[PDB]
Swiss-Prot record, chains A, D:
Tissue expression summary: Primarily expressed in hematopoetic cells including B-cells, T-cells, NK cells, monocytes and macrophages. Not expressed in non-hematopoetic cells such as fibroblasts or endothelial cells.
Function: Cell surface receptor for the cytokine IL10 that participates in IL10-mediated anti-inflammatory functions, limiting excessive tissue disruption caused by inflammation. Upon binding to IL10, induces a conformational change in IL10RB, allowing IL10RB to bind IL10 as well. In turn, the heterotetrameric assembly complex, composed of two subunits of IL10RA and IL10RB, activates the kinases JAK1 and TYK2 that are constitutively associated with IL10RA and IL10RB respectively.
Protein name per UniProt: Interleukin-10 receptor subunit alpha
Source species of the chain: Homo sapiens
Post-translational modifications: Phosphorylated. Phosphorylation of the cytoplasmic tail induced STAT3 activation. Ubiquitinated by BTRC; ubiquitination leads to endocytosis and subsequent degradation of IL10RA.
Record's subunit section: Interacts with IL10. Interacts with IL10RB. Interacts (via its cytoplasmic domain) with JAK1 (via N-terminus). Interacts with BTRC; this interaction leads to IL10RA ubiquitination and subsequent degradation. Interacts with STAT3. (Microbial infection) Interacts with human cytomegalovirus protein IL10.
Extracellular side: 1-202
Family per record: Belongs to the type II cytokine receptor family.
Residues of the full protein shown: 23 to 224 of 578
From Swiss-Prot, chains B, C:
Example of a GO MF term: cytokine activity
Family the entry assigns: Belongs to the IL-10 family.
Organism expressing this protein natively: Epstein-Barr virus (strain B95-8)
Alphabetically ordered keywords of this record: Coiled coil, Cytokine, Disulfide bond, Evasion of host immunity by viral interleukin-like protein, Glycoprotein, Host-virus interaction, Secreted, Signal, Viral immunoevasion
Gene Ontology annotations for the cellular component aspect, listed alphabetically: extracellular space
Protein known as: Viral interleukin-10 homolog
Subunit structure, as described in the record: Homodimer.
Top-level taxon in the UniProt lineage: Viruses
Positions in coiled-coil regions: 71-119
Chain positions carrying an annotated carbohydrate: N101
Disulfide linkage: C1-C93, C47-C99
Keyword Coiled coil attributed: yes
Compartment(s) of residence: Secreted
Length: 202, 142, 142, 202
């Protein structure tokens, strides 16, 4: 064809300080084709190229979006390039802000006590996150957790419990041997989706 | 206070219902709501700033929208109600929206005044000195 | 602040101009302006109470008077202006009448919005999330 | 005539805690006639007789109006009585409040210093005034004074000066022998009339 096609879509998929941009490839993409990713900070009419060429279908924009939780977000865009020709830019439909960040927990600790199990929810400590910029710092109130408990041995069924803190307690009936837990965080004041955690057993 | 965390999420959820419609139509990228507005909010003129902003959206922005793009008219409206709702709870919790809170003493008095009919206009005017005194007292408390 | 002692005396002097007219016509002897009103004035709802009272006199009490007894109509009016005057100086000295002080950030923004015409309705709606955030921030400061 | 006449007028004349009520006598008043003075506190529909009979044309209502400076004022009235018959009541035209109190100074002290005269304005210390209820207490701000100075020997002319405090200073030209002063107090925020003080000389 005359000109090169544009990436059909461009969108973000982020966790706490894991701001990865994504896009769908153009059709009939030759090996020699790559993509140019550019960033726009809301409140400044001026784009900035981040990668002149990327032979992937995603890019980690965290290093450059470290201000997400203190800003009004960004606008990201991509355009395919092959040789001297390129396509139209395809910008993200919405403005990327903390609202589009999928909540996750760092991990979960389970302890055997008196006659119950004590859970300690460890929040995400991404390595690149500014020192002062902590999870509790960004989301200082209304942090809640949906909890899933599965007994083992046993079938693949779970008991759902709701907790208002990073530490919860589950009374024990005794008869059960091992228990496995997973956690899903949220913030009562926000509509952010949350990511279920990985199985954690005793 | 009561249940403001949920009132926020409601407002937010209502917004996600029209987020993609609008943020796809706005091709300029300057910030309308400057940080300046945030500062007022942090200042004594805070209550008035917040009220003017709610008013702004409810009377200018949203109506004009619903009547410019019917598609999301109902959606824009649903969000608007979520705002009115949130407004009520705010002044029903003093600390937040007092500048929209009408004095109870004044209501009672306006009643007594009207229950005095024509006898009231004289009572009001005759106590004008008492009024200045209160005004005066009030100032002192500054 | 500036010259409020004189503003009071002016108001008072204007009152002495109609004091005998009214206090001769009011034969009931109960207090209209209860101490309750004084309390509101001493409370957070103070600014709003004082504004409602000034409004009350200026819109209900005085007008109704001037148009019930022409004799002192001009005198009632002269007093009314002394009140409007005093009102201005009060909000021009923050501390006193802020609840009548319109946010500057909001004005600037409403302008920018109108200078964007139809492009503005989208910009406003698209930044609604930014709005909720400010609202949210504001609350935090409570 | 059939019934007894009423006092034509009834009005107050007060200084700081010197609340004297006054009235004009009825015409053709017999020796056997006197007056009944009654007090009304604003905010209470109920009059109270203070004197059943007074063969004067004034009455000291201070003892009973001690709350003037913390109240919304009073209403006073009088009616002539002779034998078993009496007249209509004649109430004061306006409500008596602090606004109708004529400001006065307790006295003035004059001192000879370096090369000037120092004036000390002593405010009214009425004996009946409540302990806490002081002049400075009632009128806490904007107390000002109009000052009149006359030289002696010399004609009866005065120099007018305006002061914002209870103490003022008048530079001396030397040549003048004795000086006499009088003071007139007011409150910038109120329209109360003020009473010139008695001559005070060095």
């Amino acid at each position: 064809g005359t000109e090169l096609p544009s990436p059909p879509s461009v969108w973000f998929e982020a966790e706490f300080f894991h701001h990865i941009l994504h896009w769908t490839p153009i059709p009939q993409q030759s090996e020699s084709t790559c993509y140019e990713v550019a960033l726009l900070r809301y409140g400044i009419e001026s784009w900035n190229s981040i990668s002149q060429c990327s032979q992937t279908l995603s890019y980690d924009l965290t290093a450059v979006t470290l201000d997400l939780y203190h800003s009004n977000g960004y606008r990201a865009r991509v355009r395919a390039v092959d040789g001297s020709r390129h396509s139209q830019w395809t910008v993200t439909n919405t403005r990327f802000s903390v609202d589009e960040v999928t909540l996750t927990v760092g991990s979960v600790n389970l302890e055997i006590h008196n006659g119950f199990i004590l859970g300690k929810i460890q929040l995400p400590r991404p390595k690149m996150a500014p020192a002062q910029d902590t999870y509790e710092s960004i989301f200082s109130h209304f942090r809640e957790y949906e909890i899933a408990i599965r007994k083992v041995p046993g079938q693949f069924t779970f008991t759902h419990k709701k907790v208002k803190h990073e530490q919860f307690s589950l009374l024990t009936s005794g008869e059960v041997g091992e228990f496995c837990v997973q956690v899903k965080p949220s913030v009562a004041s926000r509509s952010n989706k949350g990511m279920w955690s990985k199985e954690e057993c005793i | 206070c009561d249940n403001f965390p949920q009132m926020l999420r409601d407002l937010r959820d209502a917004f996600s219902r029209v987020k993609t419609f609008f943020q796809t139509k706005d091709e300029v990228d300057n910030l309308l709501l400057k940080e300046s507005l945030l500062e007022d909010f942090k200042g004594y003129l805070g209550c008035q700033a917040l009220s003017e902003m709610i008013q702004f959206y409810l009377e200018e922005v949203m109506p004009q929208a619903e009547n410019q793009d019917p598609e999301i008219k109902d959606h824009v409206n649903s969000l608007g109600e979520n705002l009115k709702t949130l407004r009520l709870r705010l002044r029903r919790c003093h600390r937040f929206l007092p500048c929209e809170n009408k004095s109870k003493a004044v209501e009672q008095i306006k009643n007594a005044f009207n229950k005095l009919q024509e006898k009231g206009i004289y009572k009001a005017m005759s106590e004008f000195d008492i009024f200045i005194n209160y005004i005066e007292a009030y100032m002192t408390i500054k």
